[PDB]
């Protein structure tokens, strides 16, 4: 039971289903089937992914479950409830990225102030 | 690992206007997942009952079935010259979806 790893970038969400290897993987959403040919070409599919390009705020949010070919939708061993916010070019500033940005900028500021001190003392 | 799905009766003797049933026993519990296909003498087959409870689109209403667990059956009455066929069942739980030997009616 590997958890469904999710990679959200910008306004697209890529729902990966790490279990059910090798076989075809389908998808289901609010007990309704997506991941194939339908009216909207935004919600794609792949061998492992369900790429919802132009992901809506609530029109595409619900219970997202993968099941292999042959297995029933309720025969799947796992569920996921997805409700996420999207933007045009938002990035999640978690504690690691914020700390990295702060330490990079403080090292940049220290190096620039040391260099400015050096050439100001030199002239 | 495939379900060895077999029918008890392979050749059934009946007559016109008779109501007779067709038995099909599964090797495992397949949670109301069967179908009931009929085979015409020329080889043209079609679906009559799916999910064992609901009827196919465009089927005559005289075809019906019931059962759950491992014992499933087809209920058919008023056999005609159009209804002489061989009747099949299939499982839906585990790949591959295995058929049976089929029960052929006799006039």
């Amino acid at each position: 039971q590997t958890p469904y790893k999710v990679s959200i970038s910008g306004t697209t969400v890529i729902l990966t289903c790490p279990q059910y290897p090798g076989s075809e993987i389908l998808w289901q959403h609010n007990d309704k089937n997506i991941g194939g040919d339908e009216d909207d070409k935004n919600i794609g599919s792949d061998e492992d992914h369900l790429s919802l390009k132009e992901f809506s705020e609530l029109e595409q949010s619900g219970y997202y479950v993968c099941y292999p070919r042959g297995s029933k939708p309720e025969d799947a061993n796992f569920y996921l409830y997805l409700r996420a916010r999207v933007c045009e070019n938002c990035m999640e500033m978690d504690v690691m990225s914020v700390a990295t940005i702060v330490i990079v900028d403080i090292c940049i500021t220290g190096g620039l102030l040391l260099l400015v001190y050096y050439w100001s003392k030199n002239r | 690992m495939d379900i060895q799905m077999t029918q008890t009766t392979s050749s059934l003797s009946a007559s016109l206007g008779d109501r007779v049933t067709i038995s099909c026993r599964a090797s495992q519990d397949i949670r109301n997942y069967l179908n009931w296909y009929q085979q015409k003498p020329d080889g043209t087959v079609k679906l009559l009952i799916y999910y064992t409870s609901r009827l196919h689109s465009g089927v005559p209403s005289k075809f019906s079935g019931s059962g759950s667990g491992t014992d499933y059956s087809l209920t058919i009455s008023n056999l005609e010259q159009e209804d002489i066929a061989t009747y099949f069942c299939q499982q839906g739980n585990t790949l591959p979806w295995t058929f049976a030997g089929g029960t052929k009616l006799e006039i």
Epitope: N33, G36, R69, G70 | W97
Partner: nanobody, 120 residues
């Protein structure tokens, strides 16, 4: 209406490779799964596998994983089977059967083809 026409019966010699088509008409072909079913000896139906027309990913029977190969030309709305290493045991009818795309409705074969009497 919806109906599937297949290739004619071909007297294919054993050891060669056969190709049987089945057209799909009256419905959107890329949105319904095509299941390929062999009727051995005229009595016992055997399910060999399904090929998804859209993705192209095909799941086979465990017995017929190596003895069959399914391809789809989506432009001409066709479903193909490249039968390989034919034997006199393969002298049987080979239907192609439409089920639904998704797992709630892919287990019932709605409509069936005519049948290629692939005589070996």
């Amino acid at each position: 209406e919806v109906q599937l026409q297949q290739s004619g019966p071909e007297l294919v010699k054993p050891g060669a490779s056969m190709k049987i088509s089945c057209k799909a008409s009256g419905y959107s072909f890329t949105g319904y799964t095509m299941n390929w079913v062999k009727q051995s000896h005229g009595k016992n139906l055997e399910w060999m596998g399904l090929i998804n027309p859209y993705k192209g990913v095909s799941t086979y029977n465990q017995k017929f994983k190596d003895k069959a190969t399914l391809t789809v030309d989506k432009s001409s709305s066709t479903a193909y089977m490249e039968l390989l290493s034919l034997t006199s045991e393969d002298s049987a009818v080979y239907y192609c059967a439409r089920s639904g795309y998704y797992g709630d409705s892919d287990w019932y074969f709605d409509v069936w083809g005519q049948g290629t009497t692939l005589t070996v």
